[PDB]
C-alpha cells in the first residue's frame, strides 16, 4: 500500500511536468481510443 | 489615510456640528498611533 502511494505520487508528477516521461511513448496518451471517432 | 478618515466622517449620518468638531480634531491628530486611536473612536460613534 505504501509502495502504491509512492507510485501514485510519481505518476502524477511525471505527467503534469513535461519532459519527464522517460520514454513511455507520450504518457498523456495512455487513454483508450474509441469515442466513435474512427477517421482512419 | 487622513483623506479616507475624513471621507468616513463626511459620509456618516452624524450631526453637522459634530462632524465639524471631529474634522477639527482629525486635523489636530498628527501621529500614526493617534490616528489609529481616532479611527477606533470614530468607529465607536458610528456604531453607537
Amino acid at each position: 500500500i505504501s509502495i502504491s502511494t509512492l507510485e501514485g505520487h510519481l505518476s502524477s508528477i511525471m505527467i503534469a511536468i513535461p519532459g519527464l516521461g522517460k520514454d513511455p511513448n507520450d504518457p498523456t496518451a495512455d487513454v483508450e481510443i474509441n469515442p466513435d471517432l474512427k477517421p482512419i | 489615510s487622513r483623506s479616507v478618515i475624513r471621507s468616513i466622517i463626511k459620509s456618516s449620518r452624524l450631526e453637522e456640528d459634530r462632524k465639524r468638531y471631529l474634522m477639527t480634531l482629525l486635523d489636530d491628530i498628527k501621529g500614526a498611533n493617534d490616528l489609529a486611536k481616532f479611527h477606533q473612536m470614530l468607529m465607536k460613534i458610528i456604531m453607537k
Binding site: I1, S2, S4, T5, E7, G8, H9, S11, S12, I13, I15, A16, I17, P18, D26, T28, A29, D30, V31, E32, I33, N34, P35, D36, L37, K38, P39 | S1, S3, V4, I5, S7, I8, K10, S11, H39, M43
Partner: protein, 1484 residues
C-alpha cells in the same frame, strides 16, 4: 461600390502612428512624440529614396495649403489630441454651421406646433389610469418647451459643428484634381480632406490636425453629452445628479490640457470609485474605507509619477471627488456608471501593450503539489457527482489505485456519493486514478460554431504582408493567405471534422510551417489585445471549447431549538489577468482527466504546447517592425512588438476549461473556512456569496457582522490557496461587501436593483450602424433606446416626447443633410415645403404606414398583442386629442397594398402588406448568405441547400396557407421547425459583414438590377409615405371611434385581398392594453366605476403604509413532434390530415405514423416587493397578465418621486372592459424525390369527483344538469321524487329551464327528424304533439314536484301545465340556439363501460345534427337517418347542412359544431347527492 457608405460611428481604436504618418507624408510639423521612433525613421528613409505613390501625393498639396494658411498666423502652435480635448469639446462657428441650424430651428417650429396636443394625449392616458392629481405642473412645461431646453444646452453649438464636419468628410470619402481650400469662419478656419482635417482658431492661434476616427469620436461624445444633459435637465429626479455630472465634466476637462493621455487613468478610476463610495455606506465593520484607500493611493500615484505632484492639488482633487460621489439616494449612485465613456477614448501604441503582456507572460512561478492535488480531487468529485446524479446512482467508469481508502472503494461498490470533505481528506487516494470514456463526440450534429466569422492571421513565412510597403524600409513579401474563417470553411472541398481533431492528436500541429499568432488593439477601452491565428488551429480551438461546453461543463453548472436563518456577504474579484497566469503544469492534470473522459490523446493541453514554441507579435499596420531586411520570426529579438516565447494563455480561447479548473479551489477554501459558497461568473467579474447560518432572534445588525467576519476569514484562506497555485489575487483590487454585488442588470443592494437609466439615452444618436443610411432603422433605434430607458427608470411621457422630437429631427436630417445622391427634387421640396405632411408622417405609427416605432401601450408593457390593432388605437387617441385629423384614418384604410407572397406572410405573421418597409441591410445579408451557402462546395452542406429551394419553400407555404381559412401564425410555427426554418436559421447565423458582400459583388451574386433597386429604397419609402398622406379616398362604413379589432380586420382584408380573395383570417387580433383597462385608487372611498357601472371584473392591488421605498431527445425529433402537434391542432385531427403531418415530420426525423402518433403529446422593485395582488374578482390569459404588468407600472408611476408610502394604505382597482373544427387541403404537397439524411436536419435514431374542490357556480350547473337529465330520462322510461322535491327547492330556475330544453330536444330529435318539420314553431308543434301523446302518469313526478307550493312559486290540470312547461323550455332552448347563447353548454353522460362512450357520443351528435337540420334546412331536403350507422348518418347530415349553408345566404350564422359531451364514470345519484351535500356543507 455605389451601395456602401463611410462609417457613421466609431468602430476602431485611436492610433498615434496613423496621425504621425499622415503629417509626415504631408510634411507638416507636429508636436507628437512616439515611444517607438521607427516610423519617424522609415518614412524619412523612403523620402531619401524618392519613393512616391498615389497616396503620398494629395497630402503634399494639403500640406502646402496648411503652410500657406499658417504663414498668415505668426505664433501658431499645434496641440496634440488629448491636450486639446476641452477646446474641441467647446468649439463653435456661426457661419460654418448655418444649414443644420436652419434644419433644427424648423424642427423646433414643428414640435412647437404639436407639443401641447402631445401633452393633452399623455394627460388623457394618465387620467384613464387614475393619476390625475399626481401629475406635476412642471411636466407640462417640460413637454411643451422641450426644444428650447435642448437648444439651451452648452453642448448644442459643439454638436452642430461636429455633425457638419463628419457629414462633409463622409461626402469626400464617397466622392474620391481639386485641392481643399480653407473655409474662413467667424472664429475658426476649417479644411476637410479625405484623411486630414485642419482647424485653426483665429483668436488663440491653436492648430488642430484630426483624422476621421477622431471626428467620429468627438461627434459621438458631444451628441451623447447633449442627450444626457437634456434628459437630466427635463426630469426632476436627476437634479443633484445633473449638478454633480456638470462639475465632473468641468473638472476632468480642465485636467485634460495639463496631463493629456494619463488623464484617462483617472477617468478609468471612476468605475472603482463609485463602488468605494457605495462601500462607505456599509453598516457593518471597518471595511467602509477599504477600497477607497486603494483608489486614493492610485490617484496619488497618477499625480506623482507625472510630475504634477503637490500637497495642495491632491487635497482639492479629493474634495472634488467627495462632492461628486457622496449622495444619500441609493438609486442615483449607479447613474455615474453611465458616464464612463463620456470623456473620449485614449490613443494607443503597440509597444506599450506588447511590454504589458511581455511582463506577465515571462514571469517564473513556484507551485505547491498538495493544493493542486486537493483541487484535482474536488474536480474528480464534481464530475463523479454529476454523472451519478444524471445516471441515477451509478459511478462513472474509473479504476481506483491499490492505495485507495476503504471509504472510496465501498462508496464505489455501494453507489454512494462523495462529499467535499471526503475528497479533501482523501486526496492521496485520487493520485493515480484513470477515468474511462463515457462522453460521445458529435461534431456532425453542430455546424453553427464554424459559421461565426472570425479573423485569421497570415502565414509565418509572410507575416510582414500585413504591413504596407509605404511604412517599411524593405519591401514586404506578398500575402497569399485568406483573411476570414468562413471563406476558408465554405470553400473547402474536403472537410472532415475528425481530421481537425487528428491534426492535434497526430502531432503535426507542432511542426507546421504556416502557424502564426498575432495581436490587435481593442476598439473602445478607457484603459487590451485580441488574438488572431490560422485556420486549422482556430478550428481546433472552436471544437475544443464546444466539446467542453456540451458534456462536462453542464456538470459544473448549478438542539437548535431557537431556529436558524441564512445571512450572506459578497466578494467580487476581477479575472482578467488570470489567463496570463495559467501554466502547463497547473492545467495539465485537469486536461489529462478531460482527455480520459473524452477519449482523445493529448488534446486539451494543446494551447500551452503550441505557444511555448511560437513567437507572438502585436500587429498594427501603421506601426512598422524595426528591421532593415526580411527575416523569419524566430530570429527576431524579444523587443518592441515581439514576445518571443510565451508560457501562458492568450485571452479567451480556453475560458471554459480555466473556469472549470478554477471552481475547485474556491470549494477547497470553502471547506477549510467552514462556509457555504455560491459562485456567479461574469465577464471579468466573479461574485462569491459566503453563507453562514445565524440565530433568527438576533437583531439584523449582528447577523450581518457575523457574515462579514466569516467572509473575511474565507477571503484570507482563498488568497493563500490562489497564491499557492500562482494566480495572485491582489487583495486591494478585490471588493468585499455585505450588501452589494455587481451583475448585468445593475448593482444589487440587499434586494434592490440600482439601474443605469442614462446609458441608453446617451446611445440615442442620429443614424444606426448600417451599410446604407436608412431612416427607418434609425427611428427604430431611437424607439428601442427610449423604451429601454423607460424600463430602467426614466419617465414615460418625457421619453415619448424626446422620441417625437428626435424622429422629426432625423427626418429633417435625412431629407436635408445627407450624402445620398438619390434624393432628387421630386420628393425633397414637397416634403420640406409641406410641414403638416412631415409631422403627420413623423407621428403616425409604423405598422400602419408611418415612421414612429413606439406605441403608447409599449411605454407601460413590454409585450403588446397586435401591432396593427395597437397602432389603430394609438391613431384614434391622437385623433381624439386633435393631434392628427380624422381623414388620416381613412387614408390608412385606403392605402395601396404591397406585393408580397405567401412566404413573406408566413415569415412575418403580423405584417400588413406595406410598400417597401423592409430594411436594405437585412435583405442584402439574406441574398449574400444564400448565394455563398448555395455555392459552397463543403461536404457537410451536401443536401441542406438546393438551387430550387425557394420554389419548394413557396410551395410549402402555399400548401399551409391557401386553405379556406387562412391562419398565418400556425404556418409560421410549422415553417419555422421545418427544413425551410433550418435553412433560414443557418443563413441567419452567418454574419457576412462588408467583406463577403464585396466578395459577392466581385462574384456577381448581387446583380446590377438588384444594386439599383436596393440603392433607392429610402427615396421610395418617402415617396410611399407622401402618396399615402396626400391621397383622398373615403369609405362610408368606417366611423370615428369604432372598434380597433374591426378596423384591423378591415385593413388586413383590404391589404391582403389579392392572395386571400375573401377568405377569413384567424388568430391575429388581440385587444389593446390601454383602451381595455380603466383604473381607480381608493382609501376609504367608493370606487365610482363600481358604484355606478356595476363593473365587477377588476384586479386588486394593495400597498401598505409606512414603508421605506428607497431604503432597505434530439433537436430534430423535438422539431418533428412540434410540427405534428401544430398541424394536428390547427387543421383538424383525422386520418387524412395525419398522413400529411407524418410526411412533414418525416423530413426531420425517422418515425412512422404509429410512432409519431404515440410520441406526440426592472425598476418595479421599489414598489412591487411591498404590493399585494389578488385576481379573485377577475373572471385571454395574455390580457390578464398584461393587466397585472400595467397595474405594477401604475404603482411604479405613483411612487416615482415619493420617498415613503405615507400615512395611508393604497388600493388600486384595474378594471377590464369587455369557429372551425377542421380546415381541409386545396393544394397537393410537392415533397421531394429523396430525403436528405444529413445530421443537421435529419435524425435517424428514434431513441426515446371531489365536490369540495368544485366551485359554487360549477356546483349549481352539475346539480341543474343532474336534475334535468334524470327527470327527462325517467319520463322516457315512463323516495326519489321527494329527493327531486328537495333538489327543486335547492336549484336555480334559469339553468334548470335551459337544461330541460336541452334534454327534451335530445330525446325527441329522432321523432322530429322522422316527421321533418321546418322552423322553430312547427318543431315546437310536433314536440307538443309528442307531449300530448304522453299520459298523466308519464309526467306524474313533475306533477308531484309542482304540488309543493315553494317549488311552484320559484318556477313561475298539472299534466297540461307540465306539457306547457316543457314546450316553453324547448322554445327558450331553440331561441338561445339560434343566436348562439349557449356559451356554457354541456350534455352530461353517465357511463358504466368505457367502450360504448364513442357509440353514445355518435348517437347524441346525430340527434343534435337532426335538430340543426330540422331548424335550418328546407323540409324534405334532409337525408333519412333510418337504417344507417351513427357515424354514417352524422357524416351525411354534416354534408347536407354544409351544402345547404353554401347554397343559401343564411347558414353562416348557424353553427354546424357538435355539442360538448362531458363524460363521468359516476351515476346520477352519486353526483346529485354529492352536489346537495356540498351545497349544504358549503356556505349558501
Amino acid at each position: 461600390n455605389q451601395i456602401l457608405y463611410p462609417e457613421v460611428h466609431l468602430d476602431s481604436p485611436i492610433v498615434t502612428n496613423k496621425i504621425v504618418a499622415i503629417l509626415e507624408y504631408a510634411r507638416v510639423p507636429h508636436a507628437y512624440s512616439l515611444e517607438d521612433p521607427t516610423l519617424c525613421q522609415n518614412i524619412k528613409h523612403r523620402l531619401k529614396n524618392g519613393f512616391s505613390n498615389q497616396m503620398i501625393i494629395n497630402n503634399v498639396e494639403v500640406g502646402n495649403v496648411i503652410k500657406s494658411k499658417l504663414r498668415s498666423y505668426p505664433a501658431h502652435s499645434h496641440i496634440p489630441y488629448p491636450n486639446c480635448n476641452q477646446d474641441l469639446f467647446n468649439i463653435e462657428d456661426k457661419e460654418s454651421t448655418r444649414k443644420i441650424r436652419e434644419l433644427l430651428k424648423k424642427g423646433n417650429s414643428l414640435y412647437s406646433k404639436v407639443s401641447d396636443k402631445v401633452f393633452q394625449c399623455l394627460r388623457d392616458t394618465n387620467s384613464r389610469l387614475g393619476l390625475g392629481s399626481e401629475l406635476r405642473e412642471d411636466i407640462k412645461e417640460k413637454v411643451i418647451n422641450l426644444g428650447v431646453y435642448m437648444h439651451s444646452s452648452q453642448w448644442f453649438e459643439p454638436f452642430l459643428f461636429w455633425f457638419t464636419v463628419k457629414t462633409e468628410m463622409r461626402s469626400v470619402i464617397k466622392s474620391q484634381r481639386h485641392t481643399p481650400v480653407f473655409f474662413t469662419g467667424s472664429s475658426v478656419e476649417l479644411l476637410i480632406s479625405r484623411d486630414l482635417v485642419a482647424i485653426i482658431s483665429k483668436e488663440s492661434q491653436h492648430v488642430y490636425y484630426l483624422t476621421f476616427e477622431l471626428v467620429l469620436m468627438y461627434c459621438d461624445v458631444i451628441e451623447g453629452r447633449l442627450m444626457t444633459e437634456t434628459a437630466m435637465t427635463i426630469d426632476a429626479r436627476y437634479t443633484e445628479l445633473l449638478g454633480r455630472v456638470r462639475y465632473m465634466w468641468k473638472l476632468i476637462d480642465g485636467f485634460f490640457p495639463a496631463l493629456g493621455n494619463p488623464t484617462y487613468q483617472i477617468v478609468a478610476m471612476l468605475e472603482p470609485l463609485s463602488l468605494a463610495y457605495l462601500q462607505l455606506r456599509d453598516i457593518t465593520v471597518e471595511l467602509r474605507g477599504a477600497f477607497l484607500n486603494h483608489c486614493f493611493t492610485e490617484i496619488h500615484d497618477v499625480l506623482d509619477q507625472n510630475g504634477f505632484s503637490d500637497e495642495g492639488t491632491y487635497h482639492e482633487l479629493i474634495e472634488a471627488l467627495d462632492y461628486i460621489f457622496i449622495t444619500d439616494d441609493i438609486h442615483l449612485t449607479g447613474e455615474i456608471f453611465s458616464f464612463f465613456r463620456s470623456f473620449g477614448h485614449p490613443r494607443l501604441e503597440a509597444v506599450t501593450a506588447a511590454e504589458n503582456v511581455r511582463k506577465y507572460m515571462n514571469q517564473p512561478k513556484v507551485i505547491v503539489y498538495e493544493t493542486l492535488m486537493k483541487g484535482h480531487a474536488i474536480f474528480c468529485g464534481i464530475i463523479i457527482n454529476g454523472y451519478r446524479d444524471r445516471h441515477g446512482g451509478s459511478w462513472p467508469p474509473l479504476t481506483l489505485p491499490l492505495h485507495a481508502a476503504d471509504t472510496i472503494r465501498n462508496a464505489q461498490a455501494s453507489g454512494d456519493g462523495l462529499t467535499h470533505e471526503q475528497c479533501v481528506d482523501n486526496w492521496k487516494s485520487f493520485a493515480g486514478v484513470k477515468f474511462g470514456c463515457f462522453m460521445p463526440l458529435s461534431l456532425d450534429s453542430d455546424l453553427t460554431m464554424y459559421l461565426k466569422d472570425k479573423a485569421l492571421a497570415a502565414l509565418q513565412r509572410e507575416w510582414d504582408s500585413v504591413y504596407p510597403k509605404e511604412f517599411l524600409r524593405y519591401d514586404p513579401p506578398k500575402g497569399t493567405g485568406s483573411r476570414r474563417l468562413v471563406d476558408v470553411f465554405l470553400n473547402d472541398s474536403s472537410f472532415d471534422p475528425y481530421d481537425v481533431i487528428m491534426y492535434v492528436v497526430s502531432g503535426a500541429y507542432l511542426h507546421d510551417p504556416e502557424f502564426n499568432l498575432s495581436y490587435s488593439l481593442k476598439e473602445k477601452e478607457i484603459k487590451r489585445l485580441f488574438a488572431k491565428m490560422t485556420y486549422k488551429m482556430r478550428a481546433c480551438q472552436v471544437i475544443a471549447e464546444n466539446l467542453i461546453s456540451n458534456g462536462i461543463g453542464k456538470y459544473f453548472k448549478d438542539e437548535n431549538m431557537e431556529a436558524y436563518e441564512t445571512v450572506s456577504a459578497f466578494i467580487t474579484t476581477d479575472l482578467k489577468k488570470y489567463c496570463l497566469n495559467w501554466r502547463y503544469e497547473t492545467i495539465s492534470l485537469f486536461a489529462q482527466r478531460l482527455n480520459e473522459i473524452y477519449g482523445l490523446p493529448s488534446f486539451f493541453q494543446w494551447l500551452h504546447k503550441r505557444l511555448e514554441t511560437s513567437v507572438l507579435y502585436v500587429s498594427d499596420p501603421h506601426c512598422p517592425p524595426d528591421l532593415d531586411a526580411h527575416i523569419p520570426l524566430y530570429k527576431v529579438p524579444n523587443d518592441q512588438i515581439f514576445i518571443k516565447y510565451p508560457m501562458g494563455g492568450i485571452e479567451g480561447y480556453c475560458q471554459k476549461l480555466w473556469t472549470i479548473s478554477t471552481i475547485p479551489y474556491l470549494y477547497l477554501a470553502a471547506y477549510e473556512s467552514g462556509v457555504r459558497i455560491a459562485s456567479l461568473v461574469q465577464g471579468d467579474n466573479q461574485t462569491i456569496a459566503v453563507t453562514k447560518r445565524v440565530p433568527s432572534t438576533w437583531p439584523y445588525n449582528l447577523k450581518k457582522r457575523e457574515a462579514a467576519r466569516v467572509t473575511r476569514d474565507y477571503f484570507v484562506i482563498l488568497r493563500q490557496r490562489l497564491h499557492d497555485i500562482g494566480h495572485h489575487l491582489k487583495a486591494n483590487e478585490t471588493i468585499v461587501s455585505s450588501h452589494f454585488f455587481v451583475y448585468s442588470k445593475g448593482i444589487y443592494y440587499d434586494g434592490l436593483l440600482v439601474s443605469q437609466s442614462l446609458k441608453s439615452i446617451a446611445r440615442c444618436v442620429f443614424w444606426s450602424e448600417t451599410i446604407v443610411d436608412e431612416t427607418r432603422a434609425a427611428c427604430s433605434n431611437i424607439a428601442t433606446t427610449m423604451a429601454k430607458s423607460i424600463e430602467r427608470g426614466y419617465d414615460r411621457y418625457l421619453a415619448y416626447s424626446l422620441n417625437v422630437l428626435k424622429v422629426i429631427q432625423q427626418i429633417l436630417i435625412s431629407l436635408g443633410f445627407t450624402i445620398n445622391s438619390t434624393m432628387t427634387r421630386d420628393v425633397v421640396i414637397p416634403l420640406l415645403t409641406n410641414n403638416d405632411l412631415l409631422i403627420r408622417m413623423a407621428l403616425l405609427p409604423a405598422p400602419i404606414g408611418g415612421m414612429n416605432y413606439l406605441n403608447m401601450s409599449r411605454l407601460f408593457v413590454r409585450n403588446i398583442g397586435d401591432p396593427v390593432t395597437s397602432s389603430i388605437a394609438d391613431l384614434k387617441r391622437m385623433i381624439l386629442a386633435s393631434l392628427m385629423p380624422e381623414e388620416t384614418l381613412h387614408q390608412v384604410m385606403t392605402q395601396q397594398p404591397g406585393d408580397s407572397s405567401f412566404l413573406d406572410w408566413a415569415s412575418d405573421p403580423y405584417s400588413a402588406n406595406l410598400v417597401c418597409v423592409q430594411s436594405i441591410t437585412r435583405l442584402l445579408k439574406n441574398i449574400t448568405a444564400r448565394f455563398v451557402l448555395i455555392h459552397s462546395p463543403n461536404p457537410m452542406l451536401k443536401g441542406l441547400f438546393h438551387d430550387d429551394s425557394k420554389e419548394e419553400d413557396e410551395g410549402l407555404a402555399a400548401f399551409l396557407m391557401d386553405r379556406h381559412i387562412i391562419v398565418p401564425r400556425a404556418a409560421h410555427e410549422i415553417l419555422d421547425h421545418s427544413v425551410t426554418g433550418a435553412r433560414e436559421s443557418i443563413a441567419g447565423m452567418l454574419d457576412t459583414t462588408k467583406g463577403l458582400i464585396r466578395a459577392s459583388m466581385r462574384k456577381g451574386g448581387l446583380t446590377s438590377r438588384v444594386i439599383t433597386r436596393l440603392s433607392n429604397y429610402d427615396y421610395e419609402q418617402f415617396r410611399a409615405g407622401m402618396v399615402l398622406l396626400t391621397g383622398r379616398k373615403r369609405n362610408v362604413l368606417i366611423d370615428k371611434e369604432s372598434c380597433s379589432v374591426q378596423l384591423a380586420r378591415a385593413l388586413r382584408s383590404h391589404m391582403w385581398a389579392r392572395l386571400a380573395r375573401g377568405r377569413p383570417i384567424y388568430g391575429l387580433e388581440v385587444p389593446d392594453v390601454l383602451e381595455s383597462m380603466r383604473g381607480h385608487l381608493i382609501r376609504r372611498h367608493e370606487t365610482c366605476v363600481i358604484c355606478e357601472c356595476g363593473s365587477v371584473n377588476y384586479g386588486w392591488f394593495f400597498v401598505p403604509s409606512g414603508c421605506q421605498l428607497d431604503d432597505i431527445p434530439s433537436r430534430s425529433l423535438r422539431s418533428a413532434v412540434r410540427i405534428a402537434t401544430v398541424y394536428s391542432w390547427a387543421y383538424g385531427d383525422d386520418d387524412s390530415s395525419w398522413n400529411e403531418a407524418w410526411l412533414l415530420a418525416r423530413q426531420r426525423a425517422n418515425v412512422s405514423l404509429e410512432e409519431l402518433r404515440v410520441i406526440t403529446p426592472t425598476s418595479l422593485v421599489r414598489v412591487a416587493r411591498y404590493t399585494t395582488i389578488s385576481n379573485d374578482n377577475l373572471s385571454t390569459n395574455f390580457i390578464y397578465q398584461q393587466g397585472m404588468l400595467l397595474g405594477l407600472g401604475v404603482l411604479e408611476t405613483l411612487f416615482r418621486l415619493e420617498k415613503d408610502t405615507g400615512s395611508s394604505n393604497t388600493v388600486l382597482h384595474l378594471h377590464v372592459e369587455t369557429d372551425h373544427p377542421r380546415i381541409p387541403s386545396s393544394r397537393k404537397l410537392e415533397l421531394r424525390a429523396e430525403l436528405c439524411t444529413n445530421p443537421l436536419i435529419y435524425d435517424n435514431a428514434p431513441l426515446i369527483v371531489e365536490f369540495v374542490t368544485w366551485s359554487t357556480p360549477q356546483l349549481y350547473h352539475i346539480l341543474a344538469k343532474s336534475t334535468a337529465l334524470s327527470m327527462i330520462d325517467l319520463v322516457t322510461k315512463f323516495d326519489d321524487i321527494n329527493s327531486f322535491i328537495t333538489e327543486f327547492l335547492l336549484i336555480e330556475p334559469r339553468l334548470f329551464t335551459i337544461y330541460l330544453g336541452q334534454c327534451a330536444a335530445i330525446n325527441w330529435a329522432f321523432d322530429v327528424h322522422y316527421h321533418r318539420p321546418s322552423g322553430k314553431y312547427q318543431m315546437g308543434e310536433l314536440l307538443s304533439s309528442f307531449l300530448s301523446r304522453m299520459s298523466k302518469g308519464v309526467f306524474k313526478v313533475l306533477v308531484n314536484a309542482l304540488s309543493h307550493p315553494k317549488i311552484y312559486k320559484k318556477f313561475w290540470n298539472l299534466h297540461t301545465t307540465v306539457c306547457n312547461m316543457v314546450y316553453t323550455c324547448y322554445m327558450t332552448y331553440l331561441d338561445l340556439l339560434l343566436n348562439e347563447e349557449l356559451e356554457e353548454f354541456t350534455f352530461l353522460l353517465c357511463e358504466s363501460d368505457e367502450d360504448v362512450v364513442p357509440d353514445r357520443f355518435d348517437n347524441i351528435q346525430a340527434k343534435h345534427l337532426c335538430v340543426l337540420a330540422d331548424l335550418y334546412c328546407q323540409p324534405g331536403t334532409c337525408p333519412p337517418i333510418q337504417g344507417l350507422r351513427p357515424v354514417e348518418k352524422c357524416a351525411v347530415l354534416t354534408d347536407h347542412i354544409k351544402a345547404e349553408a353554401m347554397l343559401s345566404p343564411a347558414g353562416s350564422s348557424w353553427n354546424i359544431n357538435p355539442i360538448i359531451v362531458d363524460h363521468y364514470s359516476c351515476s346520477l345519484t352519486y353526483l346529485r347527492r354529492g352536489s346537495i351535500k356540498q351545497i349544504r356543507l358549503r356556505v349558501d
